[PDB]
């Protein structure tokens, strides 16, 4: 059966997915929080090239 | 629509519904005296509705599936062991007398609500006014305990006055050898070893308070049993019958109203029989009723509402 | 009058002990009267004596635990020179309890007091010191 | 208190002074937990009516959602007006009145003299 | 070993007019 | 027929499914065209931003 | 009762109050509670038991001495100063009296012990709307004079509120009583923060409502009037065991359930006017209002007290109660602090 | 953080729509898999602490903590296995759900940047343990036990959130990272040891204290196996992690109002080990020497010396570790005979002879038996005391050996001796908890060979 | 007396199923349940994550803080410096009271 086979068995991606969605949200955290990216006394450095950013 | 006020409003008036034969009857009596058949054809004659005798499994056959269950869900009493041993020390006696009390006030609850939304009549075997008798028999019999007939009365008191009662009362006398004999001849293992005196003092009970408190407010017909027979004329009896005695008659629409919503409302019926007095002989105990509960919804058409399982047959419940 | 029950600060402790006195038994008094008053209008007697009882009774309690509590407080005030010590204050509720236990006979409510009356007016003194604010008005 | 000050508009839910903020986010945390209680509200529903959760009523929890949500959105329109008009008020009686709020002009660490309570 | 569960001496503490 | 007392809400009630999805389709349209003349008002409020 | 009756007596209900938000003359905000008190009065008594007559009485005469006192304080500040609304310029015996006689409405304390009586004599429909709908025009009065009331009486009422709440309900079996102490306790929250801030004592009225109402939903749901009685909800509606559970602890004032916030943000509202003692007694003493919902959860949820023979009846039987409103109310009565910002302001 | 609490979350939704059979498999991997994505806090190479946003956080004191939490989970929901055999899967799924609710919300308390949201996840920490106790212990003093540990925390909690507020109208913000590097001398004056008072006493009650101890053993004694667990080995952490976040704020009154309790706590401590001689009770035993150890946390957290730090943060860890093991143990043979006594199974040596190996490497944790971490904790808040007073050794050295005492003496009137020969239900020792023996031991193992992780902010 | 079920009478879990490991009454559950244990806990996580831990590099700047220490001992012997300062800010960055 397939149907009794995915009834079950298709909670295995909740977790997984809960995870990935934190990643995302870290991310999304990390994004809001880029006042001061390459604008600190320490690891203040000047740019290199093709390199637009220092980090996302 | 469910019934409610703005359906009452809308119509579905009860006194509109009402005809000559809209009567609520109770023929009472002692055992082996006549009455379910006296029932039945006064039923059909009269083309009002046939109510049986309630027993242990009533709220079992007009529920759910409509079956008996197993006495563990419908009591845990047993009428065979009550006349096997009545002085039990398990408390066999009050706990069937008070399942009986609380089937037989559901019943007068649905032949209530029947009346009043179509306006038929009804005819019942016996009534909740007609159910101390036994308590007194036992009780006198030393079956119980005083506590619980004082319990018996207070959920009397709490439960019977909200109801109307019945129009005529058929009592069918019957003496107690007359009686001690059909118990035989019907050949009941268990019912044979009831002792005379036990029908003695439910005959008493009957004869000293029923009829009596009765033939103040509704219409008693006392019938031997020569007369109970031919039953033609216990119907021409009630047909020319002038009930000019009872609350039936300072009535309205809006007090049948009540009434119906209130009968129409077995949990809000059944609601002071379960008050917790903590009498050893009805305390069921947590460890027992989980686990009966659990079992009882493990059911297969109980584990849900009606019309969301789908171990019985119904199939739109994504869309209810 | 407020000018009476304010003279308690008029001069530190350890001075006018026995002004002091005076103005806690007048306090006392007032509270036991309250008290006497809610306890024989509820909770009434069974004669007009026997409340006007209840009420002396109630009344010369309240009085006396105000006088001891008063009266210690201004001794310690005296005699170890620490004015502004609540600990004096604790000393003062703690005896004011142990009437209050001598007059109910209970060794447990004069405990009990001690630890209550003794804590209530050391908070009381603080109060006093860091310029605290019972019943504030609105500012933000 | 900020009942009385000048263009209140008595019952107005949103004053069209407040379409210069920027709308929130469809799919803001407030308004994607608000629809997390109307689910939860639809199963709490079916489960007190012994009803089958997760699996009764589909329409009912879409509904629910819905609902939440939209109470949601408009509801938080205006408390974010309520908060722009808050700060508005008060920077502008700060600049008004800045003898009141002034400066503070604050030392280094250098000319502060901080004491030391060592821990022996 | 059965989980202890409120008995008629523990329910009727709760049964009067007053706590 | 598995209940003798023939049950409420055993066939559905068809009024109520239609309203109610009708209202949820209506409300987000509302919602997701409201959001976007929103934004739109904002920016031309403030310099298209 | 008749529709006509219904109609008329509760659209009158309704409109009491209503006057008395949407005017601007203190004489038709009396005229309002008044509508109020004569309208709400055959709804209690309609059972006709002694009890219910009682309760009707001792709600009757304590309303009406609060209402002629407070037309008494209307008069007085008409006499002076020849307006009708009070203004900054008026007696502070006027105010003062004024507020207690507000307060003997409301049914603070020491002006509570017909409170519980008339909420234990009537109905559970009704305790409702007397705990819940009574209580706004007396609260809307207060908002709209917040900066003249003293804040000494209001703190002195609001400190007894609570502990003769919490003291009260702490003995108590039956639930309606239970409630009224509650009311009692909560209002004394409500008031301890008006003339600071009145936008705290609306919100934690709205909370308090929506806590309540459905508690006394499951209450009316089995007509449970007792703690032995709501000990058979295992039985009985066992699906209700989780909301009554949270909605208990809430109004409890415990995290992380929103009967919390009330507590919290007017606790920070006070210091924000050193008001440090006010509000540390007054959670100590709602400590001691959780006492007896934990005691209460304890009998009901987290515990299984006797059953008897009957209620297999009740479990045979289908039910058609609760109704929608019961679920959203628990729902946004116990897991909705995270939306608090929304909440607050 | 998120990537360690939603999945968490996603957890109960994993527990309720799992098939009644295949519940238990698929919420205990999953949470072991957690424990595994919550060990990226420990990559850390710099002095610079890791600040996930305006609300998450983790420093060296939280990363082992909230490591711990993730960990002990499936070690709950392995011992919640037993018992709750006979319970409907309902029952079931809420017991997991509560245990899931916990470890959530003590993860957000360990990693909060903002103390109100640890007072906020500080108290919702009470209704799932209240809940767990009175719900599935199994005599009557549940209620009383639940009723203590509400109240106790309570009481002591509410002075903590009126100090908290007060510190928000004088400093603008309750942030841990801004009070720290924003921070001024508190003036000697009642006001601000009432102050302190209202911060410290909370933690004091939660560690707890000696003079305020009653709340713990009712508890352990009356909750079922998992309660017992989290509570020793997290719930007590909280007050001392609480206690090194807020310390901050109170210099230099720490330095007088600390005598009190660091006596209390010096005190308490041989009076508890040497009640642990005289107790029937193998939980009271056990929750005693909890206390008893706890006791030098917070002597430790008073005087507030790098070593001592140090030291509480070991101990904490290999406590928690410890004591969740012992209750373990006991718990197994309770799971046979049913009674909590240490007198009735005496000789479990002759038939339980791997199982009394854990017994043996828990009770020599339990004592100080290096180079296990129990004992570098110790060792090093000797130090700091010995510092602090050179008298503090006395007191020290006699609950060394008090503890050596009523270790020795639970295992051998335990294990050792004649066999109760009556006791023939002495099923043999289950795979499962053999596995949750090990699962307790060996994380003290690759500790004992990694202490660098288990230091503090001040190593 | 009321009505209860008795006290039920323990069971031997071996009985029926001699190979059980302690989770199930179901053997394919048990055996399953036993076996994910093991690998979650055993084989990945205590495996894993501890070679994840032990290569985990300069944990809080240990092993730099080791190398830069070394160039510093040697920078000040070889230039004359001595190897720690009795003060670690500079006085011309401190303004001292001008107490009188
Ligand atoms: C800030 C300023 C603004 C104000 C702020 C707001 C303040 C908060 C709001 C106040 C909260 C309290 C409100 C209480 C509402 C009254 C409760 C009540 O009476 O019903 C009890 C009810 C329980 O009774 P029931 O079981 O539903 O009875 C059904 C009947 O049996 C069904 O049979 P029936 O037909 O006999 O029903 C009787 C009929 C009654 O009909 C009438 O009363 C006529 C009214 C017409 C007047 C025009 O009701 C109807 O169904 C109408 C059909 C016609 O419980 C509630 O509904 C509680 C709801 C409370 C609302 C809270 C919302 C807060 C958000
Ligand atoms: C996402 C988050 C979603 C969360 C949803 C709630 C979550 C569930 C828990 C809720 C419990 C807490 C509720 C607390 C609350 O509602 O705020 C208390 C809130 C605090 O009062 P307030 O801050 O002084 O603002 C009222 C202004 O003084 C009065 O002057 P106004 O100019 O501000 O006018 C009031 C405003 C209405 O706005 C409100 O007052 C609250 C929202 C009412 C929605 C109307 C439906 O505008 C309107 O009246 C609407 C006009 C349409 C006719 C009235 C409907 O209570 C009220 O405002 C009652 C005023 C009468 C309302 C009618
Ligand atoms: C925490 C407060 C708990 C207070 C203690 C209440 C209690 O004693 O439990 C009842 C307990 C009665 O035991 P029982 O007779 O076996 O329960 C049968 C009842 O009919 C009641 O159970 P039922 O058989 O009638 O309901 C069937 C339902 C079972 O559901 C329930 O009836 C109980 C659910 C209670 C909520 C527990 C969630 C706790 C979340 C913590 C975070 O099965 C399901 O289909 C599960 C669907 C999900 C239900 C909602 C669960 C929370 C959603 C969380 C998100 C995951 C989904 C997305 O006592
Ligand atoms: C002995 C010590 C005597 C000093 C007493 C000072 C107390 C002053 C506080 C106010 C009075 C409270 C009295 C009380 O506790 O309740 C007593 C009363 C019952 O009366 P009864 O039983 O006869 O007296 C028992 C005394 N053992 O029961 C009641 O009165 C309960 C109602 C009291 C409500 C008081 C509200 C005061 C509000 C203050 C703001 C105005
Ligand atoms: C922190 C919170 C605690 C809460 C409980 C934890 C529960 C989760 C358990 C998951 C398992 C991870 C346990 C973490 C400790 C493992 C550390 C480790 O073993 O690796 C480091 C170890 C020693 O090397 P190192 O740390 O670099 O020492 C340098 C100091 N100068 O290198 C080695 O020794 C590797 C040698 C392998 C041989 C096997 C036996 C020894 C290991
Ligand atoms: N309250 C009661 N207590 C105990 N037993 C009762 C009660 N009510 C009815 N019974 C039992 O019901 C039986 C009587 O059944 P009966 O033979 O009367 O059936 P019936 O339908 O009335 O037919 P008939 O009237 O012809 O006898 C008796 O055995 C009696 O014990």
Same mark, same amino acid.
């Given at each position: 059966?397939?149907?009794?086979?995915?009834?079950?068995?298709?909670?295995?991606?909740?977790?997984?997915?809960?995870?990935?969605?934190?990643?995302?949200?870290?991310?999304?955290?990390?994004?809001?929080?880029?006042?001061?990216?390459?604008?600190?006394?320490?690891?203040?450095?000047?740019?290199?090239?093709?390199?637009?950013?220092?980090?996302? | 629509?469910?019934?409610?006020?703005?359906?009452?409003?809308?119509?579905?008036?009860?006194?509109?519904?009402?005809?000559?034969?809209?009567?609520?009857?109770?023929?009472?009596?002692? &055992?082996?005296?006549? @009455?379910? @058949?006296?029932?039945?054809?006064?039923?059909?004659?009269?083309?009002?509705? +046939?109510?049986?005798?309630?027993? &242990?499994?009533?709220?079992?056959?007009?529920?759910?599936? $409509?079956?008996?269950?197993?006495?563990?869900?419908?009591?845990?009493?047993?009428?065979?062991?009550?006349?096997?041993?009545?002085?039990?020390?398990?408390?066999?006696?009050?706990? !069937?007398?008070?399942?009986?009390?609380?089937?037989?006030?559901?019943?007068?609850?649905?032949?209530?609500?029947?009346?009043?939304?179509?306006?038929?009549?009804?005819?019942?075997?016996?009534?909740?006014?007609? /159910?101390?008798?036994?308590?007194?028999?036992?009780?006198?019999?030393?079956?119980?305990?005083?506590?619980?007939?004082?319990?018996?009365?207070?959920?009397?008191?709490?439960?019977?006055?909200?109801?109307?009662?019945? +129009?005529?009362?058929?009592?069918?006398?019957?003496?107690?050898?007359?009686?001690?004999?059909?118990?035989?001849?019907?050949?009941?293992?268990?019912?044979?070893?009831?002792?005379?005196?036990?029908?003695?003092?439910?005959?008493?009970?009957?004869?000293?308070?029923?009829?009596?408190?009765?033939?103040?407010?509704?219409?008693?017909?006392?019938?031997?049993?020569?007369?109970?027979?031919?039953?033609?004329?216990?119907?021409?009896?009630?047909?020319?019958?002038?009930?000019?005695?009872?609350?039936?008659?300072?009535?309205?629409?809006?007090?049948?109203?009540? !009434?119906?919503?209130?009968?129409?409302?077995?949990?809000?019926?059944?609601?002071?029989?379960?008050?917790?007095?903590?009498?050893?002989?009805?305390?069921?105990?947590?460890?027992?009723?989980?686990?009966?509960?659990?079992?009882?919804?493990?059911?297969?058409?109980?584990?849900?509402?009606?019309?969301?399982?789908?171990?019985?047959?119904?199939?739109?419940?994504?869309?209810? | 009058?407020?000018?009476?029950?304010?003279?308690?600060?008029?001069?530190?402790? $350890?001075?006018?002990?026995?002004?002091?006195?005076?103005?806690?038994?007048?306090?006392?008094?007032?509270?036991?009267?309250?008290?006497?008053?809610?306890?024989?209008?509820?909770?009434?007697?069974?004669?007009?004596?026997?409340?006007?009882?209840?009420? %002396?009774?109630?009344?010369?309690?309240?009085?006396?635990?105000?006088?001891?509590?008063?009266?210690?407080?201004?001794?310690?005030?005296?005699?170890?020179?620490?004015?502004? /010590?609540?600990?004096?204050?604790?000393?003062?509720?703690?005896?004011?309890?142990?009437?209050?236990?001598?007059?109910?006979?209970?060794?447990?409510?004069?405990?009990?007091?001690?630890?209550?009356?003794?804590?209530?007016?050391?908070?009381?003194?603080?109060?006093?010191?860091?310029?605290?604010?019972?019943?504030?008005?609105?500012?933000? | 208190?900020?009942?009385?000050?000048?263009?209140?508009?008595?019952?107005?839910?949103?004053?069209?002074?407040?379409?210069?903020?920027?709308?929130?986010?469809?799919?803001?945390?407030?308004?994607?937990?608000?629809?997390?209680?109307?689910?939860?509200?639809?199963?709490?529903?079916?489960?007190?009516?012994?009803?089958?959760?997760?699996?009764?009523?589909?329409?009912?929890?879409?509904?629910? *959602?819905?609902?939440?949500?939209?109470?949601?959105?408009?509801?938080?329109?205006?408390?974010?007006?309520?908060?722009?008009?808050?700060?508005?008020?008060?920077?502008?009686?700060?600049?008004?009145?800045?003898?009141?709020?002034?400066?503070?002009?604050?030392?280094?660490?250098?000319?502060?003299?901080?004491?030391?309570?060592?821990?022996? | 070993?059965?989980?202890?569960?409120?008995?008629?001496?523990?329910?009727?503490?709760?049964?009067?007019?007053?706590? | 027929?598995?209940?003798?007392?023939?049950?409420?809400?055993?066939?559905?009630?068809?009024?109520?499914?239609?309203?109610?999805?009708?209202?949820? *389709?209506?409300?987000?349209?509302?919602?997701?065209?409201?959001?976007?003349?929103?934004?739109?008002?904002?920016?031309?409020?403030?310099?298209?931003? | 009762?008749?529709?006509?009756?219904?109609?008329?007596?509760?659209?009158?209900?309704?409109?009491?109050?209503?006057?008395?938000?949407?005017?601007?003359?203190?004489?038709?905000?009396?005229?309002?509670?008044?509508?109020?008190?004569?309208?709400?009065?055959?709804?209690?008594?309609?059972?006709?038991?002694?009890?219910?007559?009682?309760?009707?009485?001792?709600?009757?005469?304590?309303?009406?001495?609060?209402?002629?006192?407070?037309?008494?304080?209307?008069?007085?500040?008409?006499?002076?100063?020849?307006?009708?609304?009070?203004?900054?310029?008026?007696?502070?015996?006027?105010?003062?009296?004024?507020?207690?006689?507000?307060?003997?409405?409301? $049914?603070?304390?020491?002006?509570?012990?017909?409170?519980?009586?008339?909420?234990?004599?009537?109905?559970?429909? #009704?305790?409702?709307?007397?705990?819940?709908?009574?209580?706004?025009?007396?609260?809307?009065?207060?908002?709209?004079?917040?900066?003249?009331?003293?804040?000494?009486?209001?703190?002195?009422?609001?400190?007894?509120?609570?502990?003769? %709440?919490?003291?009260?309900?702490?003995?108590?079996?039956?639930?309606?009583?239970?409630?009224?102490?509650?009311?009692?306790?909560?209002?004394?929250?409500?008031?301890?923060?008006?003339?600071?801030?009145?936008?705290?004592?609306?919100?934690?009225?709205?909370?308090?409502?929506?806590?309540?109402?459905?508690?006394?939903?499951?209450?009316?749901?089995?007509?449970?009037?007792?703690?032995?009685?709501?000990?058979?909800?295992?039985?009985?509606?066992?699906? #209700?065991?989780?909301?009554?559970?949270?909605?208990?602890?809430?109004?409890? %004032?415990?995290?992380?359930?929103?009967?919390?916030?009330?507590?919290?943000?007017?606790?920070?509202?006070?210091?924000?006017?050193?008001?440090?003692?006010?509000?540390?007694?007054?959670?100590?003493?709602?400590?001691?209002?959780?006492?007896?919902?934990?005691?209460?959860?304890?009998?009901?949820?987290?515990?299984?007290?006797?059953?008897?023979?009957?209620?297999?009846?009740?479990?045979?039987?289908?039910?058609?109660?609760?109704?929608?409103?019961?679920?959203?109310?628990? &729902?946004?009565?116990?897991?909705?602090?995270?939306?608090?910002?929304?909440?607050?302001? | 953080?998120?990537?360690?609490?939603?999945?968490?979350?996603?957890?109960?939704?994993?527990?309720?729509?799992?098939?009644?059979?295949?519940?238990?498999?698929?919420?205990?991997?999953?949470?072991?898999?957690?424990?595994?994505?919550? !060990?990226?806090?420990?990559?850390?190479?710099?002095?610079?602490?890791?600040?996930?946003?305006? #609300?998450?956080?983790?420093?060296?004191?939280?990363?082992? =903590?909230?490591?711990?939490?993730?960990?002990?989970?499936?070690?709950?929901?392995?011992?919640?296995?037993?018992?709750?055999?006979?319970?409907?899967?309902?029952?079931?799924?809420?017991?997991?759900?509560?245990?899931?609710?916990?470890?959530?919300?003590?993860?957000?308390?360990?990693?909060?940047?903002?103390?109100?949201?640890?007072?906020?996840?500080?108290?919702?920490?009470?209704?799932?343990?209240?809940? &767990?106790?009175?719900?599935? $212990?199994?005599?009557?003093?549940?209620?009383?036990?639940?009723?203590?540990?509400?109240?106790?925390?309570?009481?002591?909690?509410?002075?903590?959130?009126?100090?908290?507020?007060?510190?928000?109208?004088?400093?603008?913000?309750?942030?841990?990272?801004?009070?720290?590097?924003?921070?001024?001398?508190?003036?000697?004056?009642?006001?601000?040891?009432?102050?302190?008072?209202?911060?410290?006493?909370?933690?004091?009650?939660?560690?707890?204290?000696?003079?305020?101890?009653?709340?713990?053993? @009712?508890?352990?004694?009356?909750?079922?196996?998992?309660?017992?667990?989290?509570?020793?080995?997290?719930?007590?952490?909280?007050?001392?992690?609480?206690?090194?976040?807020?310390?901050?704020?109170?210099?230099?009154?720490?330095?007088?109002?600390?005598?009190?309790?660091?006596?209390?706590?010096?005190?308490?401590?041989?009076?508890?080990?040497?009640?642990?001689?005289?107790?029937?009770?193998?939980?009271?035993?056990?929750?005693?020497?909890?206390?008893?150890?706890?006791?030098?946390?917070?002597?430790?957290?008073?005087?507030?010396?790098?070593?001592?730090?140090?030291?509480?943060?070991?101990?904490?860890?290999?406590?928690?570790?410890?004591?969740?093991?012992?209750?373990?143990?006991?718990?197994?043979?309770?799971?046979?005979?049913?009674?909590?006594?240490?007198?009735?199974?005496?000789?479990?040596?002759?038939?339980?002879?791997?199982?009394?190996?854990?017994?043996?490497?828990?009770?020599?944790?339990?004592?100080?038996?290096?180079?296990?971490?129990?004992?570098?904790?110790? !060792?090093?808040?000797?130090?700091? =005391?010995?510092?602090?007073?050179?008298?503090?050794?006395?007191?020290?050295?006699?609950?060394?050996?008090?503890?050596?005492?009523?270790?020795?003496?639970?295992?051998?009137?335990?294990?050792?001796?004649?066999?109760?020969?009556?006791?023939?239900?002495?099923?043999?020792?289950?795979?499962?908890?053999?596995?949750?023996?090990?699962? +307790?031991?060996?994380?003290?193992?690759?500790?004992?060979?990694?202490?660098?992780?288990?230091?503090?902010?001040?190593? | 007396?009321?009505?209860?079920?008795?006290?039920?009478?323990?069971?031997?879990?071996?009985?029926?199923?001699? /190979?059980?490991?302690?989770?199930?009454?179901?053997?394919?559950?048990?055996?399953?349940?036993?076996?994910?244990?093991?690998?979650?806990?055993?084989?990945?996580?205590?495996?894993?994550?501890?070679?994840?831990?032990?290569?985990?590099?300069?944990?809080?700047?240990?092993?730099?803080?080791?190398?830069?220490?070394?160039?510093?001992?040697?920078?000040?012997?070889?230039?004359?410096?001595?190897?720690?300062?009795?003060?670690?800010?500079?006085?011309?960055?401190?303004?001292?009271?001008?107490?009188?």
């Amino acid at each position: 059966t397939l149907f009794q086979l995915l009834r079950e068995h298709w909670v295995h991606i909740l977790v997984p997915a809960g995870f990935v969605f934190g990643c995302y949200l870290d991310r999304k955290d990390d994004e809001k929080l880029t006042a001061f990216r390459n604008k600190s006394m320490l690891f203040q450095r000047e740019l290199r090239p093709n390199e637009e950013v220092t980090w996302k | 629509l469910r019934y409610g006020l703005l359906a009452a409003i809308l119509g579905d008036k009860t006194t509109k519904k009402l005809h000559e034969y809209s009567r609520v009857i109770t023929v009472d009596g002692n &055992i082996c005296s006549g @009455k379910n @058949k006296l029932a039945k054809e006064i039923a059909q004659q009269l083309g009002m509705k +046939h109510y049986p005798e309630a027993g &242990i499994q009533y709220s079992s056959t007009t529920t759910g599936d $409509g079956r008996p269950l197993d006495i563990e869900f419908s009591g845990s009493c047993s009428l065979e062991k009550f006349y096997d041993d009545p002085k039990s020390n398990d408390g066999n006696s009050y706990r !069937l007398q008070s399942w009986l009390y609380a089937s037989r006030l559901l019943q007068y609850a649905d032949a209530l609500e029947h009346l009043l939304s179509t306006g038929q009549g009804v005819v019942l075997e016996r009534s909740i006014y007609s /159910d101390f008798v036994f308590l007194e028999a036992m009780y006198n019999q030393g079956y119980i305990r005083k506590q619980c007939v004082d319990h018996y009365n207070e959920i009397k008191r709490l439960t019977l006055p909200e109801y109307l009662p019945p +129009h005529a009362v058929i009592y069918i006398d019957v003496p107690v050898p007359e009686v001690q004999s059909r118990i035989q001849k019907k050949g009941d293992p268990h019912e044979m070893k009831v002792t005379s005196a036990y029908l003695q003092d439910i005959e008493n009970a009957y004869k000293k308070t029923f009829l009596p408190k009765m033939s103040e407010m509704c219409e008693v017909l006392v019938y031997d049993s020569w007369e109970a027979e031919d039953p033609t004329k216990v119907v021409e009896d009630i047909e020319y019958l002038k009930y000019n005695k009872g609350p039936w008659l300072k009535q309205d629409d809006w007090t049948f109203h009540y !009434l119906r919503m209130l009968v129409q409302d077995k949990t809000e019926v059944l609601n002071y029989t379960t008050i917790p007095v903590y009498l050893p002989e009805i305390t069921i105990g947590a460890h027992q009723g989980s686990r009966i509960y659990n079992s009882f919804r493990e059911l297969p058409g109980r584990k849900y509402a009606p019309g969301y399982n789908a171990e019985v047959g119904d199939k739109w419940i994504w869309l209810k | 009058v407020k000018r009476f029950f304010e003279s308690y600060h008029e001069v530190p402790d $350890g001075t006018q002990c026995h002004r002091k006195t005076y103005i806690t038994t007048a306090l006392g008094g007032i509270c036991g009267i309250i008290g006497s008053a809610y306890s024989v209008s509820l909770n009434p007697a069974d004669s007009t004596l026997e409340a006007v009882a209840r009420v %002396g009774r109630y009344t010369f309690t309240a009085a006396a635990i105000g006088a001891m509590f008063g009266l210690t407080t201004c001794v310690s005030a005296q005699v170890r020179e620490k004015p502004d /010590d609540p600990l004096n204050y604790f000393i003062g509720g703690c005896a004011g309890g142990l009437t209050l236990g001598a007059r109910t006979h209970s060794y447990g409510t004069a405990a009990m007091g001690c630890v209550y009356m003794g804590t209530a007016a050391a908070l009381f003194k603080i109060g006093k010191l860091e310029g605290w604010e019972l019943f504030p008005t609105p500012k933000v | 208190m900020m009942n009385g000050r000048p263009g209140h508009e008595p019952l107005k839910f949103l004053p069209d002074e407040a379409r210069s903020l920027p709308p929130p986010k469809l799919n803001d945390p407030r308004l994607v937990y608000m629809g997390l209680l109307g689910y939860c509200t639809g199963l709490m529903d079916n489960m007190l009516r012994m009803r089958p959760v997760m699996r009764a009523g589909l329409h009912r929890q879409l509904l629910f *959602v819905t609902s939440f949500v939209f109470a949601g959105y408009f509801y938080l329109k205006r408390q974010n007006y309520l908060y722009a008009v808050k700060d508005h008020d008060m920077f502008g009686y700060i600049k008004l009145h800045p003898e009141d709020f002034p400066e503070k002009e604050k030392k280094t660490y250098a000319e502060i003299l901080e004491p030391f309570h060592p821990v022996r | 070993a059965r989980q202890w569960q409120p008995d008629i001496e523990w329910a009727e503490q709760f049964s009067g007019a007053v706590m | 027929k598995f209940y003798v007392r023939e049950p409420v809400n055993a066939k559905p009630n068809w009024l109520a499914v239609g309203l109610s999805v009708g209202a949820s *389709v209506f409300m987000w349209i509302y919602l997701i065209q409201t959001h976007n003349e929103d934004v739109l008002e904002y920016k031309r409020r403030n310099g298209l931003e | 009762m008749n529709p006509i009756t219904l109609a008329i007596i509760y659209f009158t209900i309704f409109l009491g109050p209503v006057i008395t938000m949407s005017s601007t003359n203190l004489m038709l905000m009396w005229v309002g509670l008044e509508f109020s008190l004569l309208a709400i009065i055959p709804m209690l008594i309609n059972k006709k038991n002694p009890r219910s007559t009682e309760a009707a009485t001792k709600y009757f005469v304590t309303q009406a001495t609060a209402s002629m006192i407070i037309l008494l304080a209307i008069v007085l500040n008409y006499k002076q100063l020849g307006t009708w609304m009070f203004q900054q310029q008026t007696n502070g015996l006027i105010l003062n009296m004024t507020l207690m006689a507000l307060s003997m409405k409301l $049914g603070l304390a020491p002006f509570h012990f017909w409170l519980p009586e008339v909420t234990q004599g009537i109905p559970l429909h #009704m305790g409702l709307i007397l705990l819940t709908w009574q209580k706004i025009a007396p609260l809307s009065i207060l908002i709209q004079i917040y900066p003249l009331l003293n804040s000494t009486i209001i703190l002195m009422l609001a400190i007894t509120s609570i502990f003769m %709440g919490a003291w009260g309900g702490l003995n108590q079996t039956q639930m309606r009583k239970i409630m009224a102490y509650s009311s009692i306790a909560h209002m004394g929250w409500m008031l301890a923060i008006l003339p600071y801030n009145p936008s705290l004592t609306l919100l934690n009225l709205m909370i308090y409502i929506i806590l309540t109402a459905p508690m006394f939903m499951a209450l009316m749901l089995n007509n449970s009037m007792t703690i032995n009685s709501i000990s058979l909800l295992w039985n009985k509606t066992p699906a #209700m065991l989780t909301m009554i559970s949270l909605m208990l602890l809430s109004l409890g %004032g415990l995290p992380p359930l929103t009967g919390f916030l009330p507590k919290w943000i007017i606790i920070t509202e006070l210091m924000k006017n050193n008001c440090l003692i006010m509000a540390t007694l007054m959670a100590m003493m709602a400590l001691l209002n959780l006492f007896f919902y934990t005691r209460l959860i304890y009998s009901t949820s987290l515990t299984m007290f006797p059953t008897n023979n009957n209620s297999k009846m009740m479990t045979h039987q289908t039910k058609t109660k609760p109704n929608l409103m019961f679920s959203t109310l628990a &729902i946004m009565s116990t897991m909705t602090l995270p939306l608090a910002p929304q909440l607050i302001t | 953080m998120l990537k360690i609490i939603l999945p968490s979350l996603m957890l109960l939704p994993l527990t309720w729509l799992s098939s009644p059979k295949k519940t238990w498999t698929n919420v205990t991997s999953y949470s072991f898999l957690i424990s595994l994505t919550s !060990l990226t806090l420990l990559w850390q190479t710099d002095e610079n602490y890791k600040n996930f946003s305006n #609300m998450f956080s983790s420093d060296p004191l939280s990363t082992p =903590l909230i490591i711990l939490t993730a960990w002990l989970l499936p070690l709950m929901l392995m011992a919640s296995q037993n018992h709750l055999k006979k319970d409907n899967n309902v029952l079931q799924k809420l017991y997991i759900s509560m245990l899931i609710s916990l470890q959530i919300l003590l993860i957000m308390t360990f990693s909060a940047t903002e103390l109100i949201m640890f007072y906020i996840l500080f108290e919702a920490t009470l209704i799932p343990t209240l809940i &767990i106790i009175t719900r599935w $212990g199994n005599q009557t003093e549940r209620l009383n036990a639940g009723i203590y540990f509400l109240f106790y925390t309570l009481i002591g909690s509410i002075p903590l959130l009126i100090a908290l507020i007060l510190i928000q109208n004088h400093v603008g913000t309750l942030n841990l990272m801004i009070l720290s590097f924003t921070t001024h001398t508190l003036d000697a004056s009642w006001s601000n040891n009432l102050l302190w008072l209202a911060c410290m006493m909370a933690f004091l009650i939660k560690m707890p204290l000696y003079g305020v101890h009653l709340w713990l053993p @009712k508890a352990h004694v009356e909750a079922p196996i998992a309660g017992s667990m989290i509570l020793a080995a997290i719930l007590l952490k909280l007050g001392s992690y609480g206690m090194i976040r807020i310390s901050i704020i109170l210099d230099p009154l720490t330095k007088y109002m600390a005598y009190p309790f660091i006596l209390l706590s010096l005190w308490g401590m041989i009076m508890t080990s040497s009640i642990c001689l005289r107790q029937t009770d193998l939980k009271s035993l056990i929750a005693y020497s909890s206390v008893s150890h706890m006791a030098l946390v917070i002597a430790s957290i008073m005087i507030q010396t790098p070593w001592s730090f140090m030291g509480a943060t070991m101990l904490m860890i290999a406590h928690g570790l410890t004591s969740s093991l012992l209750f373990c143990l006991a718990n197994s043979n309770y799971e046979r005979i049913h009674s909590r006594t240490m007198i009735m199974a005496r000789g479990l040596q002759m038939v339980f002879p791997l199982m009394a190996t854990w017994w043996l490497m828990a009770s020599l944790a339990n004592l100080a038996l290096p180079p296990s971490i129990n004992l570098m904790g110790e !060792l090093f808040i000797t130090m700091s =005391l010995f510092s602090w007073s050179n008298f503090t050794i006395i007191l020290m050295g006699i609950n060394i050996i008090i503890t050596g005492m009523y270790s020795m003496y639970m295992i051998i009137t335990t294990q050792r001796g004649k066999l109760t020969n009556h006791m023939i239900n002495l099923q043999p020792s289950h795979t499962r908890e053999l596995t949750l023996m090990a699962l +307790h031991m060996i994380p003290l193992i690759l500790l004992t060979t990694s202490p660098k992780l288990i230091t503090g902010l001040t190593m | 007396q009321w009505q209860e079920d008795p006290e039920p009478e323990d069971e031997n879990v071996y009985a029926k199923n001699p /190979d059980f490991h302690g989770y199930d009454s179901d053997p394919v559950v048990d055996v399953w349940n036993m076996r994910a244990v093991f690998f979650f806990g055993f084989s990945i996580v205590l495996v894993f994550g501890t070679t994840f831990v032990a290569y985990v590099p300069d944990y809080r700047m240990q092993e730099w803080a080791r190398r830069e220490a070394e160039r510093l001992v040697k920078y000040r012997e070889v230039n004359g410096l001595p190897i720690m300062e009795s003060n670690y800010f500079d006085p011309s960055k401190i303004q001292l009271p001008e107490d009188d």
